[PDB]
Amino acid sequence: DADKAVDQIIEDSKRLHIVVNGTGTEQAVAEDGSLLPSVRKALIDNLYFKTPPLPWRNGGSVNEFNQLYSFTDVSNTTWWYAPGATVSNPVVMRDSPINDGKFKVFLDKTNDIYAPLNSPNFVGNPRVPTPAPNSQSIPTTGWVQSEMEGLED
Amino acid sequence: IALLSSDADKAVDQIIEDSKRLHIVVNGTGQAVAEDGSLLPSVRKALIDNLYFKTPPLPWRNGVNEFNQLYSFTTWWYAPFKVFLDKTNIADIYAPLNSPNFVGNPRVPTPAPGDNSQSIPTTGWVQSEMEGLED
Amino acid sequence: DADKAVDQIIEDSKRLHIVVNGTGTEQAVAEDGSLLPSVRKALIDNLYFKTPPLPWRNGGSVNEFNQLYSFTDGNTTWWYAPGATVSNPVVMRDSPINGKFKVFLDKTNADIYAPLNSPNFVNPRVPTPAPGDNSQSIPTTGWVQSEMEGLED
Amino acid sequence: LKDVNHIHPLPDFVRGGFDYVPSDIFSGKENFEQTLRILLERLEFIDQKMVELAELRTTLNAEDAILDEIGRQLGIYRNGLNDPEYRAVIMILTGNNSKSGTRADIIATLKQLFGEDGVTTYKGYNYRLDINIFNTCMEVTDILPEIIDMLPLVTHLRVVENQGY
Amino acid sequence: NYGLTGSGFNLPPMDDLVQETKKTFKSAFGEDFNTESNSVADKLIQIFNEREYQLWLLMGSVYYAQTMQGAEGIYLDDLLGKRGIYRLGKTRSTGTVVMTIDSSVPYNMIYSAATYTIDTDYELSSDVQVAGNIVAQLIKGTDVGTYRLQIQNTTDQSVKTLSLNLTATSGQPLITFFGQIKDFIVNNTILSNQDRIWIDSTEGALYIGYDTNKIMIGLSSRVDFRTNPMAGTRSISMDVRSIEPGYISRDVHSVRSINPTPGGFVDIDNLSAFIDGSDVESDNEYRIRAATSISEGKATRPAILAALLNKVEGIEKVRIFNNNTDKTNSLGIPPYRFMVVCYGGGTAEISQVLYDTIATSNNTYGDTFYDITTDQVERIWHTKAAARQLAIRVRYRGRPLSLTEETAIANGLATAVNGTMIAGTLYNVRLVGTVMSSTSPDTQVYVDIKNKGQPDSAYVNTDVTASTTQVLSLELEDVIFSQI
Amino acid sequence: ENYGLTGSGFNLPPMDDLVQETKKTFKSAFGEDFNTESNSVADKLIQIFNEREYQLWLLMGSVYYAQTMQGAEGIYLDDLLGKRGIYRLGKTRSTGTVDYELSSDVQVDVRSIEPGYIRDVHSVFIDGSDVESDNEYRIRAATSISEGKATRPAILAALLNKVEGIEKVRIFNNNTDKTNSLGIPPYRFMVVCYGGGTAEISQVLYDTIATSNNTYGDTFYDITTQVERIWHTKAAARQLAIRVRYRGRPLSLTEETAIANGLATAVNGTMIAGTLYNVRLVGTVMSSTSPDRFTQVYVDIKNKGQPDSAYVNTDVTASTTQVLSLELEDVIFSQI
Amino acid sequence: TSPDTQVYVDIKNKGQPDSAYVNTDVTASTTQVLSLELEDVIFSQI
Distance from D20 to chain F by nearest Cα, in Å?
19
Query: In whole angstroms, what is the distance from residue E36 CA to residue E22 CA?
Result: 9
Candidates E68, E69, E79, E382: best to mutate against F (most CBs of F within 10 A) is E68
Partners of C12 on chain A (C-beta within 8 Å) are 16-17, 20-21
B57: enclosing H helix or E strand: strand B54-59
Across the interface, whether the CB atoms of D68 and G3 are under 8 A apart is answered no
Residues of F (205-244) whose Cβ lies below 8 Å from D: 209-210, 212, 214
- Interface check for E371 against chain D (CB to CB < 8 A): the answer is no
Q: What is the DSSP string of B74-129?
A: --EEE---EEEE-S--STTTB-BSBS-B-BS--B-PPPPTT--SSBPPPHHHHHHH
Across the interface, whether the CB atoms of C125 and B109 are under 8 A apart is answered no
Neighbours of C8 (CB within 10 A): 18
Question: Residue E157: exposed, middle, or buried by beta-carbon count in 10 A (0-12, 13-18, 19+)?
Answer: exposed
Residues of E (47-66) whose Cβ lies below 8 Å from D: 47-48, 50-52, 54-55, 58-59, 61-62, 65-66
Distance from C80 to chain B by nearest Cα, in Å?
14
**What is the signed CA dihedral for E253, E255, E261, E264, rounded to 10 degrees?**
-20
Q: Do chains E and A touch (3 or more CB pairs under 8 A)?
A: no
Distance from F36 to chain E by nearest Cα, in Å?
16
Nearest CB among E6, E21, E66 relative to F74 is that of: E6
Contact present, B68 and B81 (Cβ < 8 Å): no
Across the interface, whether the CB atoms of C9 and B7 are under 8 A apart is answered no
Candidates F38, F212, F225: best to mutate against E (most CBs of E within 10 A) is F212
Q: Do chains D and C touch (3 or more CB pairs under 8 A)?
A: no
Neighbours of E59 (CB within 10 A): 22
Nearest CB among B53, B104, B121 relative to A105 is that of: B53
- Per DSSP, E266 falls in state E
List all residues 6 or more positions away from F309 whose beta carbon is below 8 Å from its beta carbon. none
Distance from F19 to chain C by nearest Cα, in Å?
20
Partners of A139 on chain B (C-beta within 8 Å) are 121-123, 126
Round the CA-based radius of gyration of chain C to a whole number and report it: 23
C27: enclosing H helix or E strand: strand C27-29
Query: In whole angstroms, what is the distance from residue A131 CA to residue A116 CA?
Result: 23
Query: In whole angstroms, what is the distance from residue C149 CA to residue C143 CA?
Result: 10
Candidates F36, F63, F149, F151: best to mutate against D (most CBs of D within 10 A) is F151
Partners of B68 on chain C (C-beta within 8 Å) are 51
Contact present, D66 and E87 (Cβ < 8 Å): no
Neighbours of E1 (CB within 10 A): 6
SS3 F275: strand
Q: What end-to-end distance do the CA atoms of chain D give, in Å?
A: 43
Query: In whole angstroms, what is the distance from residue F20 CA to residue G3 CA?
Result: 43
Across the interface, whether the CB atoms of F33 and C89 are under 8 A apart is answered no
**Using alpha carbons only, what angle is made at residue F91 by residues F85 and F96, rounded to the nearest 5 degrees?**
115
Candidates D98, D128, D154, D157: best to mutate against F (most CBs of F within 10 A) is D154
Partners of D79 on chain G (C-beta within 8 Å) are 2
Query: In whole angstroms, what is the distance from residue D115 CA to residue F254 CA?
Result: 59
Q: What are phi and psi of C150, to 5 degrees?
A: -60, -35
Query: In whole angstroms, what is the distance from residue C7 CA to residue B8 CA?
Result: 9
Measured CA to CA in angstroms, residue E295 lies from D142, E160, E281, E469, F317 at distances of 34, 45, 21, 32, 41
For F29, the closest chain D residue by CA position comes to: D34
Query: Do the bridges between strand C102-103 and strand B32-33 make them parallel or antiparallel, or are there none, so unpaired?
Result: unpaired
Q: Do chains E and D touch (3 or more CB pairs under 8 A)?
A: yes
Across the interface, whether the CB atoms of F210 and D153 are under 8 A apart is answered yes
Across the interface, whether the CB atoms of A119 and C120 are under 8 A apart is answered no
Contacts 24+ apart (CB under 8 A), F305-314: F306/F241, F311/F243, F313/F278, F314/F278
Neighbours of F251 (CB within 10 A): 18
Resolution (A): 3.2
Nearest CB among F7, F69, F209 relative to D73 is that of: F69
List all residues 6 or more positions away from E213 whose beta carbon is below 8 Å from its beta carbon. none
Q: Do chains F and C touch (3 or more CB pairs under 8 A)?
A: yes
Across the interface, whether the CB atoms of C59 and F33 are under 8 A apart is answered yes
Q: What are phi and psi of E207, to 5 degrees?
A: -115, 130
List all residues 6 or more positions away from B31 whose beta carbon is below 8 Å from its beta carbon. B24, B39, B40, B41, B42, B45
Contact present, E408 and E414 (Cβ < 8 Å): no
**What is the signed CA dihedral for F72, F75, F79, F85, rounded to 10 degrees?**
110
Query: In whole angstroms, what is the distance from residue F180 CA to residue F305 CA?
Result: 35
Closest CA to E99 of E273, E257, E272: E257
Distance from D153 to chain F by nearest Cα, in Å?
6
SS3 A6: helix
Query: In whole angstroms, what is the distance from residue A77 CA to residue B76 CA?
Result: 12
Other chains touching C, judged by 3 or more CB pairs under 8 Å: A, B, F
Any alpha helices (H) in E152-215, and if so which ranges? 172-186, 191-194
Neighbours of C108 (CB within 10 A): 13
Measured CA to CA in angstroms, residue E339 lies from C45, E231, E345, F189, F211 at distances of 94, 42, 16, 22, 11
For F283, the closest chain G residue by CA position comes to: G3
Q: What are phi and psi of B6, to 5 degrees?
A: -55, -10
Across the interface, whether the CB atoms of F148 and D98 are under 8 A apart is answered yes
Across the interface, whether the CB atoms of C141 and B49 are under 8 A apart is answered no
- Per DSSP, E67 falls in state S
Neighbours of F46 (CB within 10 A): 19
For G3, the closest chain D residue by CA position comes to: D77
Residues of chain C that touch chain F, judged by Cβ-Cβ distance less than 8 Å: 59, 61, 87, 89, 91
Query: In whole angstroms, what is the distance from residue E109 CA to residue E133 CA?
Result: 12
Across the interface, whether the CB atoms of B120 and C127 are under 8 A apart is answered no
Other chains touching D, judged by 3 or more CB pairs under 8 Å: E, F, G
Across the interface, whether the CB atoms of D68 and G2 are under 8 A apart is answered yes
Query: In whole angstroms, what is the distance from residue E308 CA to residue E314 CA?
Result: 9
Query: In whole angstroms, what is the distance from residue E152 CA to residue E132 CA?
Result: 9
Question: Residue F186: exposed, middle, or buried by beta-carbon count in 10 A (0-12, 13-18, 19+)?
Answer: middle
Taking CB atoms and an 8 Å cut-off, how many pairs form between chains D and E?
133
Other chains touching G, judged by 3 or more CB pairs under 8 Å: D, F
Query: In whole angstroms, what is the distance from residue B71 CA to residue B76 CA?
Result: 5
Max Cα–Cα distance, chain B, nearest Å: 81
List all residues 6 or more positions away from A66 whose beta carbon is below 8 Å from its beta carbon. A45, A48, A49, A81, A83
Any alpha helices (H) in chain F, and if so which ranges? 15-28, 41-67, 74-82, 134-140, 152-162, 201-208, 254-268, 278-287
Query: Do the bridges between strand F294-303 and strand F215-216 make them parallel or antiparallel, or are there none, so unpaired?
Result: unpaired
Measured CA to CA in angstroms, residue E90 lies from D109, E94, E196, E411 at distances of 19, 13, 40, 50
For G2, the closest chain D residue by CA position comes to: D77
Distance from D79 to chain G by nearest Cα, in Å?
7
Closest CA to E360 of D161, F187, B29, F237: F187
Query: In whole angstroms, what is the distance from residue A105 CA to residue C44 CA?
Result: 17
